[PDB]
Ligand binder design. Structure first.
Ligand SMILES: CCC[C@@]1(CCc2ccccc2)CC(O)=C([C@H](CC)c2cccc(NS(=O)(=O)c3ccc(C(F)(F)F)cn3)c2)C(=O)O1
Ligand SMILES: [Cl-]
Ligand SMILES: [Cl-]
Lengths: 99, 99
């Protein structure tokens, strides 16, 4: 698709068999989801946003569908205000910026 | 151009007589720049994102050039960790997400 930016680029994602709404965010290195449970081991990470730093849990090699496009990669979980899809997964689905 | 997302989408902007590096951020409602002087009236604003809220100065009707494309819009100025071009200006330069 082509997504214009007059509204927030919110899309449906599927993770763990469940649908969620998430923001396509070209300013995010990483994908960060609101508190939830994921299987497997996790490792710690500190990430920065516009307001400062947050602690998150890093899960690797997680299956996640974004606008119907299948990705498998790193998902961070922590106190983000919205589910954010960052560049690590935007590149997996072939996303570019165009103007 | 067509900008891929393997690295942060940083571009050159021209604003208030200055050349700066800024991040094209489809996740940001607003454009927020690190501390700088801008002409005219301003009012305080709180903006929130990852890590919480920061207080910024809101300047309206500010001319800007982003990667060679002219626009006008609101520019916020405050303690953001990086200069961020948000949707309010990305729309004006015809920026879309494509996959
Ligand atoms: C996972 C962190 C993502 C990010 C990283 C910024 C960064 C980049 C390089 C180095 C250091 C830091 C980019 C980003 O879009 C935001 C948020 C949106 C999720 C953001 C950015 C800019 C302004 C705002 N405030 S706002 O009022 O314009 C606003 C508020 C809320 C939302 C919502 F969509 F997230 F709800 C979008 N915009 C928020 C942020 O807080 O940090
Ligand atoms: Cl990844
Ligand atoms: Cl505006």
């Amino acid at each position: 698709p082509q997504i214009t930016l007059w509204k927030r680029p919110l899309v449906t994602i599927k993770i763990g068999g469940q649908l969620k709404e998430a923001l396509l965010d070209t300013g995010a290195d990483d994908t960060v989801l609101e508190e939830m449970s994921l299987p497997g081991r996790w490792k710690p990470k500190m990430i920065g946003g516009v307001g400062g730093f947050i602690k998150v849990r890093q899960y690797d090699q997680i299956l996640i569908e974004i606008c119907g496009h299948k990705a498998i990669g790193t998902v961070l979980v922590g106190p983000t205000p919205v589910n954010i899809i960052g560049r690590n997964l935007l590149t997996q689905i072939g996303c570019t910026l165009n103007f």
